[PDB]
């Protein structure tokens, strides 16, 4: 229907964000991104409504939860991060993306801005029940080593550099695994388990709830397993979840529970990461100077995956500011 | 915003064509790529007056000229070749590819089924007026070794392996320039004059006029210079020209004359060629079996060029012609 | 122990050979390739001896059977085709490689410049009974289709566009399997069966015997099965076979028979082909002008396979024939 | 015929380093690389003396400054980093590299592991005198943006995330430039200024002085400018500076002073980075299971750069510690 057109949205949000890469301005980065994604997303033939975005109305003037978007077409619910990794992008760190998923009405978990435990593994073969948040780290990786046909010492486990991950990092290591640390970007790091050239076999750790819904949306189209659990340390978070319909607070959600039906997923890299290469300036002797975006588009029914590298003309003698929409 | 949806038309055309590759069938090959091209079009939302279909009128009752393909919207002009080099498809020779192009009402030259003399070079910089058909082969190659800034022994020049070209070859060679030869198709041969790492600087040859204007469209998105002229043997080859809006019959068409306006150009490789790579069978252990297609989509206004590798899920224990509807 | 230095000889050969690409002088093409290759060899610290190659002395090639070569080092037997495609290099055709192979003295089959039946398949775990020249085309294709877990129509079969192959072209096609033709060398074509992104599954064909030994030496490092048999039509060929104690004349030869012990294989693309990419001219605004070469070098002991993209600075405003020296 | 064999050394160190990746043990990782590199290097046909290694006579048992290495051959001064980023590898961070360079006697600055101020830009199109440590961040960035024919806002400047890099980050960002921060690895950060799809124009920062000599070696092969200065900042460092022919401890060193003459540079990636990708496990259905290394070899005389993708066969059902010596 609309699948291949969403990638223009992510591409322009990543050009805008790339304008603010290395500037150290989390707010200019996130605003150039929201600006440009909203501007491009009001031009796709959809009757879309932002199920997940930059927050509730009062806080976010643009791409707030509930906002009507799209120019006219099939009725869909929209999940987005105009820029996943505003801090990353502001520093020039790895694993920053612009991300956008779409489903038939009510297909995404209606997730509050709250932490979420995660375990993910890639593979179309026959994984499921392979991965379970209520089981040991050792048992999950023992199963995964069996499924992949490797020694435990070959598995590469990704998680975020935090204190809250210390125990998983220790258990996975004495269990025999290799555990690598990303500063930030667990969307990139979850999807990297099902991304053909990452060096990452498993992702374990806790991070945003929306990041986890968007990553599950990708693993639906790539093929994988993933469990998630929302978590709380604050009655304000519990009321926040109560106000979204969520009553079963310790529910383990599987990939189907997080994204269901005809999902389409699209991302663009802003900086080099686990999953996508970053945006680059190129000057050829042929067509002159241009900017290069690396994008992916994926669909859950057909399961076609498309890797797209786009060349965008730019003089580069006036500021990168003109990449901002 | 008509553009990127064009890519799945050429993707499905090259899949159907790849099904018949290496089987010795010319009719099954091209006529299987035409079916898919059109059944892809007849589920796309566009209104498509066909400028360049297949059969003139008599040859086959559903790929005519004046055909209206798609499903309404913009009424743009749709040039096709659902497979060029369809002998070279049915037994694996290089440079088979499925192409779809479209512009505004005669953005193009509506072309007849006669032969065409062509000279082409690539890369949008400052070459203006550079190649002439009248003017000498040595003079053309001298001017463009000047422009590209290289000694003339470096220039690679490309031609169809026909005896009708023996002069150009010899003369280009007696000029001291390496000259390669294809058996195949001159769309990818001319287009490869502005493709990045093709290893080809110039095309000089006589081939079909449809293929000439399709590569002209490519070249106006990639930014090259081309001159062509239409030639005739029997006077029925004169018939269908004045019966189309032409009486300067030995008119000399420069690049704007074959294609101008807001142009979209989409191609997908069927076999490994000088421009795209062909379809392949891959067995991912993460993803299981699929077929990759290597594709390009571009546009004359923006001059944006997208390279698209697509993973199409397929279980290769089923007949290859499951790709064929 | 000279593993990777051999790749420099094939690089120098392919650059000199590229000088004469499509210059229609077969003689100056292979003269340039033999001059470059033999000087590069003489600066490789080996006590090499040229045990495979067409001709003797002043009969066809300049490097010839029984010539001592090198600058000291280990004593080694050298298999060659200083350019297995001087017919295609000066023609402008595909599958032009420069090739070299090294074994312990007595490592290669001493073949008596006679033709050869060849059937080759790729695959790390191919059983050796998997392919048999005494069996039907179709039995072979059905057995390897089983091994690969494919429908026989998925299998792409590659052979040379020669009249003597029409029969196996036909039977292979009545399998509903697909058959693709090359006018060019069969070293490229046999190794493409164990090459990552060649679209070629099986090679069946008759061709020269040096080319068979070089193909066997590559498949021995790459993996996969190959069976070969020398063709003895005349009392003269048989006596040449008895002048070297070849008792059985119908012996079927496996890879271990064709090349045995410690094998080094190295090849460099001259033009685009089934296995390697051709040499190209590049201009980058931060490096400059260089020609790129695409090589493979490999060894049977380690079973290590190295892929070498090399950049050779060259000012291209001056004459193309400076790599030749 | 010694140039390329250096890649075998770095590969061998990188596979051993890779055993220890994400294992949390930095001594085990540096020790695995030191042991693998020393063993591999004693196989190489050179009369090498270590001029830059792991430490001095007393501190470092293996690869100590002054050590005679190699099997015997041409007299060379060796500069080594068995493992750059021992911390990086232990945690699976970016820009872990194994590195080896060779030159004639006196070709290297014999640098102790003191800190070094560094500024680096790449380009073979005649940059020189463009970077000065004594100039402002603003003056240098202005000259560089002019030299690249680019707006000041386009330059990506790179430095390590350190408090001692506050001024350069602040000052650089107020000129309008983008500044990106790497956790560690200033060899990969400086060499990225002269690497093709590096998104990095300048490196400004302070780090290891040996890491600076080695980045200088690469840049003499790749083309670029760089200026550096040692910081002997405790009296033992200053006296151990006078102990090696130094007296002007505030001397600025040009690139020629850090690496001059006949220079061979080789490196292999351990983790993904700004210069090289990291080692991966690959499980291919044709080729079997292997570990990919990505390496670069280059020479300053010939300005030849070789990008080397190596496939090292491995049963990944055995411990990854098999990749150790
Ligand atoms: Mg965000
Ligand atoms: Mg056609
Ligand atoms: Mg070190
Ligand atoms: Mg240091």
Author numbering:
A (entry chain B), B (entry chain C), C (entry chain D), D (entry chain A): 4 to 328
Quote the paper.
The crystal structure of the class II fructose-1,6-bisphosphatase (FBPaseII) from the important pathogen Francisella tularensis is presented at 2.4 Å resolution. FBPaseII from F. tularensis (FtFBPaseII) was crystallized in a monoclinic crystal form (space group P21, unit-cell parameters a = 76.30, b = 100.17, c = 92.02 Å, β = 90.003°) with four chains in the asymmetric unit. The structure reveals an approximately 222 symmetry tetramer in the asymmetric unit that exhibits subtle structural alterations in some peripheral loops, resulting from amino-acid residue insertions, that probably stabilize the tetrameric structure. Finally, the C-terminal 11 amino acids adopt a unique fold forming a compact hydrophobic core that includes three Phe residues (Phe317, Phe319 and Phe326) and a short helical segment (H14), packing against Trp21, that is unique to FtFBPase. Chain A had two coordinated Mg2+ ions in its active center, which is distinct from previous findings, and is presumably deactivated by their presence. The first cation is nearly octahedrally coordinated by the side chain of Asp84 and the the C=O group of Leu86 plus four water molecules. The second cation, Mg2+(2), interacts weakly in an approximately trigonal bipyramid coordination with the side chains of Glu214 and Asp116 and two water molecules at the apices of the pyramid. However, in the crystal structure this active-site region, in chain A only, is essentially covered by residues from the symmetrically related chain D. This packing effect results in an active site with no space left for the substrate/product (F16BP/F6P) that was present in the crystallization medium. Thus, it is reasonable to hypothesize that the crystal structure of FtFBPaseII presented here, and in particular the presence of the second Mg2+ site (above), corresponds to the Mg2+-inhibited structure, most likely owing to the presence of Mg2+ in nonproductive metal complexes instead of the catalytic Mn2+.
Genetic screens resulted in the identification of the gluconeogenic enzyme class II fructose-1,6-bisphosphatase (FtFBPaseII), the product of the glpX gene, as one of the most important contributors to the virulence of F. tularensis strains SchuS4 and LVS. Thus, targeted inactivation of FtFBPaseII should prevent the bacterium from producing fructose 6-phosphate (F6P) during intracellular growth, regardless of the specific gluconeogenic host-derived carbon source that is available to the pathogen. Similarity in the structure of all classes of FBPases is displayed by the presence of two adjacent α/β domains, one of which is usually two-layered (α–β ; CATH code 3.30.540), with the other being three-layered (α–β–α ; CATH code 3.40.190). Previous biochemical and enzymatic characterization of FtFBPaseII has shown that the enzyme is only active in the presence of Mn2+, as opposed to other divalent (Zn2+, Cu2+ and Ni2+) or monovalent (K+ and Na+) cations.
